[PDB]
Amino acid sequence: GEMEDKYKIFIKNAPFDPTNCQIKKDCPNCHLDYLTQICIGSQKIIILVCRCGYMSNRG
Amino acid sequence: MLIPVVCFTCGFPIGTYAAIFDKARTEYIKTKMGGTLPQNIPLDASLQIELKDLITALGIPMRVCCRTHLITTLDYRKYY
């Protein structure tokens, strides 16, 4: 399975990589205007992450 | 290595005015820039000065070919 140990480091770094795509969406935790979106794997799972530590799908 | 004696395309004798044209163009471009170093004058900026009326004053007609060859020909004395 993915999203757990295959890309744990990348997913934890995704908010800080400046070459990652952003999305104009408010953050529930820190109330930030923008979020970081990623799309990993052949199932194209969409994960939204934040600098404060927020992450979609109960991260 | 010089401006041709005649126009390559039609044969009009553009070369009887070549020396006058070269010197007069030098003076005219210097007047338009206003006394600047030859290297501080960009090659691009001096080529945008219109030489229509200077060529007209030489007596050369309004032919596309003659003005092309009088304006664009490279001089070997300025490269060696």
């Binding site: 820190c30 109330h31 205007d33 | 501080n40 960009p42």
Partner: protein
């Protein structure tokens, strides 16, 4: 910081929380005067690097 302060007004109960936000701005520091100085010979690449207007990038860092 303006986003955080707008949120601080928003949660506490201010109905004008969104007026604290500022617009985002991104730009380069290269100016038309620098281009003019380059064409005049008074400005160089190693002088543009010296004040951090440009930098060198290899395919690794790209």
């Amino acid at each position: 910081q303006a986003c955080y302060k707008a949120a601080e007004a928003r949660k506490k109960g201010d109905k004008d929380w969104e007026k604290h936000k500022i617009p985002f701005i991104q730009n380069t520091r290269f100016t038309p005067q620098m281009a003019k100085d380059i064409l005049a010979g008074t400005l160089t690449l190693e002088d543009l690097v010296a004040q951090g207007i440009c930098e060198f990038i290899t395919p690794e860092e790209a």
